[PDB]
């Protein structure tokens, strides 16, 4: 391509233009309504027991009449409690490894560079 950087400049310009227009609308929405999100939503447990942010959709009939919406379950049954602990402990092992590994790097790094301590 003759000038590949030209595309990057326009894409940066397009994203900057989109940020400015979006920011102005967001500032006005907080003034008139105070809502921080332009799309309605709520925090609901899924079938897997984890807290998720469910983004609402547009419907013509109320939710108590929707055939397809009512099949979707937003509650966790008791048998998911054990799996939640298992997944939490899995992250704890991952978190522990990261914390312990960083300390190992520092201890080794002072052996070859003692001036770091001094």
């Amino acid at each position: 391509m003759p000038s590949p950087e030209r595309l990057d400049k326009v894409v940066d310009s397009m994203d900057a233009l989109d940020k400015v227009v979006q920011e102005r609308e967001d500032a006005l929405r907080l003034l008139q309504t105070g809502q921080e999100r332009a799309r309605p939503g709520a925090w609901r447990r899924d079938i897997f027991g984890r807290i998720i942010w469910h983004k609402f959709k547009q419907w013509v009939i109320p939710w108590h009449l929707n055939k397809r919406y009512n099949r979707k379950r937003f509650f966790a049954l008791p048998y998911v409690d054990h799996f939640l602990r298992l997944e939490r402990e899995k992250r704890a092992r991952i978190k522990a490894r990261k914390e312990n590994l960083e300390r190992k790097k520092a201890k080794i790094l002072l052996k070859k560079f003692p001036h770091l301590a001094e």
Partner: protein, 97 residues
């Protein structure tokens, strides 16, 4: 094959670092401190091993009744199986009766 062709990197050990020059200090805290402290209280490590000694089965049994409620589900299940196996090994297998 199976043996290195070069010498290992040289290792220099500081015989007078902070830890070695102060190793064994306060081991006579009870004798020289009017028995206010005990040398076993200077042990640092697992809460179920400070000032206590036993075989593998006794360590597993003691660990389960002290930190068993804090262990992970996988670790707790492994500990329970280890106790079951060690119970069968020591009380049913061996050369002497």
């Amino acid at each position: 094959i199976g043996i290195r062709l070069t010498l290992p990197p040289p290792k220099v050990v500081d015989r007078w670092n902070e830890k070695r020059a102060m190793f064994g200090v306060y081991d006579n805290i009870g004798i020289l401190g009017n028995f206010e402290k005990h040398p076993k209280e200077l042990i640092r490590g697992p809460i179920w091993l400070r000032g206590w000694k036993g075989n593998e089965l006794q360590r597993c049994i003691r660990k389960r009744k002290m930190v068993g409620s804090r262990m992970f589900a996988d670790d707790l299940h492994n500990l329970n199986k280890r106790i079951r196996y060690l119970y069968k090994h020591f009380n049913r297998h061996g050369k002497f009766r």
